[model samples]
Target: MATLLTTDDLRRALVESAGETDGTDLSGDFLDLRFEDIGYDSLALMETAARLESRYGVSIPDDVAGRVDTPRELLDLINGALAEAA
Candidate 1:
């Protein structure tokens, strides 16, 4: 089993990949901007997910989808996923 990534790790990845700051303070931005908003197309999404899996040691199940439309939602998802695996 693999460990989950921390909020800071996710934040850094978003910053590095999407050029988003630590706190944009836009609730809608999270709801509107998606993995695609960061230029993560199918291929990029696969690559990014793979990298995250490797870095975090957790495989996102195939059934898992992007319901997190915001940073806080994403953080909640990450924590939930981590807890489930534990």
Candidate 2:
């Protein structure tokens, strides 16, 4: 069976990939928060996507990455990607 990725998993991946000293705060109600609102740049988004890819064994294309603005959107995107892969 293929493992599913949850919002919490995405959060942990982003938090861990971002590290602690980069001023990227993943605290509070971040599901609806935009990436820019949390101070994440394109590089951060790319890194986060890479981490998600590694963790979930899924491919997140630039088109999908560019459209994702928040963790909620990312969660949905990843879920859809996983479904497509399956």
Candidate 3:
């Protein structure tokens, strides 16, 4: 399991984490932007963390998950975690 997440993977996971439509465009230039600025708050991010962990078969620490602020940052972290796990 590579668990190497793409930007779109993150975008889709974010939508899933949100659990509904906020009508925000989570595409293009979103990777570096703050998730809070993009409409995802701490709650949604935590949920995203949970979902990713479950989907990828890796357990992310709560503090680390909660500290994620950008999609690319999380991508890097998740891949690192998964690579370590594998």
For each candidate in turn, the TM-score is 0.53, 0.81, 0.81
In the range 1-86, model 2's lDDT, one tens digit per residue, is 69888867877877777774466556567788887777766787788888888877888775656777777888887787678773
* Span of 10 residues, lowest total lDDT, candidate 3: 19-28
Clashing residue pairs in candidate 3 (N, C-alpha, C atoms within 3 angstroms): none
Which is superior by TM-score, 1 or 3?
3
lDDT of 2 at 7: 64
User: Superposing every Cα of model 1 onto the true structure, what RMSD results?
Assistant: 5.1
Better of 1 and 3 by lDDT: 3
Clash pairs, candidate 2, are: none
C-alpha lDDT of all candidate models, in order:
0.56, 0.76, 0.76
Tens digit of lDDT per residue, candidate 3, span 19-58? 6566667756888888787777777778887877777767
The alpha-carbon deviation from the true structure for residue 77 of candidate 3, after best TM-score superposition, in angstroms, is 0.7
User: What are the per-residue Cα lDDT tens digits for candidate 1 across 1-86?
Assistant: 55567656765665454444444533334434666564445554455556566776666666554544444555566567778864
C-alpha lDDT of residue 76 in model 2: 84
Query: Could you tell me how far off, in angstroms, the CA of residue 19 lies in candidate 2 after the best superposition?
Result: 1.2
55: Cα error in model 1, Å = 1.7
